[PDB]
Ligand binder design. Structure first.
Ligand SMILES: [Mg+2]
Ligand SMILES: [Mg+2]
Ligand SMILES: [Mg+2]
Ligand SMILES: [Mg+2]
Ligand SMILES: [Mg+2]
Ligand SMILES: [Mg+2]
Ligand SMILES: [Mg+2]
Ligand SMILES: [Mg+2]
Ligand SMILES: [Mg+2]
Ligand SMILES: [Mg+2]
Ligand SMILES: [Mg+2]
Ligand SMILES: [Mg+2]
Ligand SMILES: [Mg+2]
Ligand SMILES: [Mg+2]
Ligand SMILES: [Mg+2]
Ligand SMILES: [Mg+2]
Ligand SMILES: [Mg+2]
Ligand SMILES: [Mg+2]
Ligand SMILES: [Mg+2]
Ligand SMILES: [Mg+2]
Ligand SMILES: [Mg+2]
Ligand SMILES: [Mg+2]
Ligand SMILES: [Mg+2]
Ligand SMILES: [Mg+2]
Ligand SMILES: [Mg+2]
Ligand SMILES: [Mg+2]
Ligand SMILES: [Mg+2]
Ligand SMILES: [Mg+2]
Ligand SMILES: [Mg+2]
Ligand SMILES: [Mg+2]
Ligand SMILES: [Mg+2]
Ligand SMILES: [Mg+2]
Ligand SMILES: [Mg+2]
Ligand SMILES: [Mg+2]
Ligand SMILES: [Mg+2]
Ligand SMILES: [Mg+2]
Ligand SMILES: [Mg+2]
Ligand SMILES: [Mg+2]
Ligand SMILES: [Mg+2]
Lengths: 60, 185, 67, 144
RNA sequence: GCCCGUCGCUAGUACCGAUUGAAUGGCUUAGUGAGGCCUCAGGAUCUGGGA
RNA sequence: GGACUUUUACUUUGAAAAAAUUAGAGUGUUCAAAGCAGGCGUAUUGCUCGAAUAUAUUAGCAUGGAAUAAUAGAAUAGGACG
RNA sequence: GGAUAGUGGCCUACCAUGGUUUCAACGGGUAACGGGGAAUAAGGGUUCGAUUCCGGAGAGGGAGCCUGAGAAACGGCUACCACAUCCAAGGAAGGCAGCAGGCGCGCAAAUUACCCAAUCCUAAUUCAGGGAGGUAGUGACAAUAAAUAACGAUACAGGGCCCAUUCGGGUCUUGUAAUUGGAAUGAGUACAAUGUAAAUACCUUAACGAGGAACAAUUGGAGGGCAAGUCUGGUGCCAGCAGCCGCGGUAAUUCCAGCUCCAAUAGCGUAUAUUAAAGUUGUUGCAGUUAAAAAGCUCGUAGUUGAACUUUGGGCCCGGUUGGCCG
């Protein structure tokens, strides 16, 4: 095939995606507490049974 | 040239990694008995797995065979000890049954909660790891201590910490330093 | 706290049947301090190079300051 | 019986014939011929460290149109010459000629990866560090 | 629609191949042959035949 | 003690058998991986349970079996007992 | 016969022509020290063992030998070969596959520390010596336990539920909350004593030591396999992704980011090897008309395999070991 195609564009897109910085958020508990948070989420309170059950919905 | 220090691993991990049913089924267990790892379930299901293996093997041998009668009876009496196996079901055809939650139910974290002391299974975790509650005056700080029958009665706070008497805590006593300093001399 | 204890029939016995370091802890013995265990090793080796007492080796090397 | 001797002393024939037929097994024959130690640009070892000759722009196989960016490396224990790929956006801007780099395999047991024809390895580190970390920013490329 | 081979380009692997080509390792002919050991002598000296 | 014995395979039970590892009994190393401890009192001059068991197959040894499968026997009788 | 401690072609002299082999000799390879064992868990297997114990071999490569009970010894000597050091040029001297430490090699691996207190070993010997060994430093090789939070108050929201003609919130808690509320503990720091040969840590324990600025968890992943978005912004078959299938050529569910979400979590990714999945090596247990595969045909030696029949039926006796109804 071809082995000496241009090299100029190496890193193109990463270099030109506009930076936005992480938004400072509440800290999430680590360990047992975190499994706790998941349990009360997934099972205890329950959210929506929109036909089934959803996990990362957005604009539903 | 010095003897091998022997060791063993104490868990097995799920064959299938993303089984949605197993995954939920495991979380609730954690959520219930206040675990932090899937490993705390893994560890137990491993303990379980061998016991079944032992028992399975035994059962194949002849009824009233020496080893079977010896080691079978030993296994039964030991399971009874901690209160996993019930008294009625004392003949190993049932140790062959025997699910994980039975084991779960007998941890020191779980017992410390069951009667009084804790109120919520997590408060139970924190108290133990924090040098409160004991067996004799022997303090225990491992949530997985697994409470033998004659010990269920001797779960109680320890002669140290507050709760079980004698001195409040470093932070309370630090607020007593902010009472008699501000208002007094 | 659990440990181990001993009590000797007399103190002539204790001083003889005891470890020399134990007496140190107690005050029944001075810590005869010595050279670095390797300094001692090196003293031994330096000595092997000399056959006999050696005072005859100081003198012949005092003829050195003639040649 | 179709074939295989069933008899009670036929154990010799039964082993021989198995020895024989194992050779049709790819990895058995690779193993016993020592194809590792003999062919293979690495030793038979997990990774190998070489030196960067030219920087290549390998064009991808169809139905994929792109330019894949690689490096010809000359393995240090070997002088065997090898082209290797430089993962993630940019990163080629990290290397330069005459540099040291760490090559690992591509996880296809021999065999090249995707649309990259010819390339059987990938870079892992350069000038001592970790390509990955340089990409993020956890580290920076050493003086010379 | 599918599709076959020569012919042309890039890149890679292995093959044949003047060099009676090169290298490393293991044995080995013939020639040369250190050294200690055994043995024929020897006898500085130093004694009662020996050392 | 004398006088003589057709060969074998198979299977049985047993001896000879290093420890650590393995399987596994006992013991609450605070749990546990481990370790081989430890446990009782008169805790003032001591009492006491341990430190199992299993596996260890091929070969050699030793013993029981006599199905399965070989072997040898008496036909130019140079047969068998006496 | 000689030689050896002693058997023996071990060596010699005479003499003879034997010894091994398709039941694979002999030769080649080995990225080969053998074993106890290790990894993989239906079973049958497959792969691995330089490496804590046992045996063997070696001390840069060869050979030779002194001493001695024991060495063909190497921290013994002699010679040669290869390295190689010091010099005043005449000469002399070295052998880390001991402990540490250095170069080189490479993907790949730690202190030029302390001690004989333990375990034991040696000597003339209770005492000396012991880089055997033990102590500590380095150390995410592996393995074990398992912190990063716990409980109430209040503010609306709720689903429970008695009533509901209709205001509703009321006492049982489901919990999402941008003001709240006091309690708890070790991570560390540190008197002290414990530890230790002396120290260090651990186990204990005065004095301190938590509110988000923290004592602030990671590592990959979110199209399918495969647990988790068809959010927003960017790029425009580029840049990159993608084990495999496949994404990207202007609404990208795969790229580059923000947000949110998943999995495992003091650990998680990747590369190489191997094991399971694999009945894709098949004894258990494969397949061969057309998918890979019955030799053109018959003979045939080795090899494997090989019909039936020879004390069977019946009678007597002893004493065991579980279990039954009775104890
Ligand atoms: Mg000394
Ligand atoms: Mg002397
Ligand atoms: Mg073929
Ligand atoms: Mg090139
Ligand atoms: Mg090399
Ligand atoms: Mg047997
Ligand atoms: Mg044993
Ligand atoms: Mg002869
Ligand atoms: Mg001949
Ligand atoms: Mg053959
Ligand atoms: Mg080798
Ligand atoms: Mg091997
Ligand atoms: Mg070995
Ligand atoms: Mg090796
Ligand atoms: Mg030797
Ligand atoms: Mg060397
Ligand atoms: Mg030679
Ligand atoms: Mg030698
Ligand atoms: Mg030596
Ligand atoms: Mg001179
Ligand atoms: Mg060394
Ligand atoms: Mg040496
Ligand atoms: Mg390492
Ligand atoms: Mg000494
Ligand atoms: Mg004396
Ligand atoms: Mg040492
Ligand atoms: Mg933290
Ligand atoms: Mg904080
Ligand atoms: Mg992340
Ligand atoms: Mg999914
Ligand atoms: Mg857009
Ligand atoms: Mg988008
Ligand atoms: Mg994304
Ligand atoms: Mg994993
Ligand atoms: Mg079979
Ligand atoms: Mg098949
Ligand atoms: Mg065909
Ligand atoms: Mg045919
Ligand atoms: Mg027959």
């Amino acid at each position: 095939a071809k082995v000496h195609g241009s090299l100029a564009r190496a890193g193109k897109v990463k270099s030109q995606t506009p930076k936005v910085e992480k938004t400072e958020k509440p800290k999430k508990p680590k360990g047992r507490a975190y499994k706790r948070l998941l349990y009360t989420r997934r099972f205890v309170n329950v959210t929506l049974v929109n036909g089934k059950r959803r996990m990362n919905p957005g604009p539903s | 040239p010095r003897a091998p220090r022997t060791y063993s691993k104490t868990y097995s991990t799920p064959k299938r990694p993303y089984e949605s049913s197993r995954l939920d089924a495991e979380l609730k267990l954690a959520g219930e008995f206040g675990l932090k790892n899937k490993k705390e379930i893994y560890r137990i299901s491993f303990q379980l797995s061998k016991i079944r293996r032992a028992a399975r093997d035994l059962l194949t041998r002849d009824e009233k065979d020496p080893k079977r009668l010896f080691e079978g009876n030993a296994l039964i009496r030991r399971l009874v000890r901690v209160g996993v196996l019930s008294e009625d079901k004392k003949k190993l055809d049932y140790v062959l049954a025997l699910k994980v939650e039975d084991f779960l139910e007998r941890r020191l974290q779980t017992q410390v909660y069951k009667l009084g002391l804790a109120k919520s299974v997590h408060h139970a975790r924190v108290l133990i790891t924090q040098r409160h509650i004991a067996v004799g005056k022997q303090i225990v700080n491992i949530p997985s201590f697994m409470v033998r029958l004659d010990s269920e009665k001797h779960i109680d706070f320890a002669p140290t910490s507050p709760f079980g008497g004698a001195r409040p805590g470093r932070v309370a006593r630090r607020n007593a330093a902010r009472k008699a300093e501000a208002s007094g001399e | 706290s659990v440990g181990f204890g001993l009590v000797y029939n007399s103190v002539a016995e204790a001083k003889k049947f005891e470890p020399t370091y134990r007496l140190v802890r107690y005050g029944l013995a001075e810590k005869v301090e010595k050279a670095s265990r390797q300094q001692r090793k090196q003293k031994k080796n330096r000595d092997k190079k000399i056959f006999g007492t050696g005072k005859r080796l100081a003198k012949k090397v005092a003829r050195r300051n003639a040649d | 019986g179709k074939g295989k001797p069933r008899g009670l002393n036929s154990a010799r024939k039964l082993r021989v014939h198995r020895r024989n037929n194992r050779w049709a097994e790819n990895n058995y024959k690779k193993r016993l011929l020592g194809t590792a130690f003999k062919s293979s640009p690495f030793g038979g070892s997990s990774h190998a460290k070489g030196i960067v000759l030219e920087k290549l722009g390998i064009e991808s196989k169809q139905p994929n149109s792109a330019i894949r960016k690689c490096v010809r490396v000359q393995l240090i224990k070997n002088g065997k010459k090898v082209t290797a790929f430089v993962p993630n956006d940019g990163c080629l801007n990290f290397v330069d000629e005459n540099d040291e780099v760490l090559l690992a395999g591509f996880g296809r047991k021999g065999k090249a990866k995707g649309d990259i024809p010819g390339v059987r390895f990938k870079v892992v580190k350069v000038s001592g560090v970790s390509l990955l970390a340089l990409w993020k920013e956890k580290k920076e490329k050493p003086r010379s």
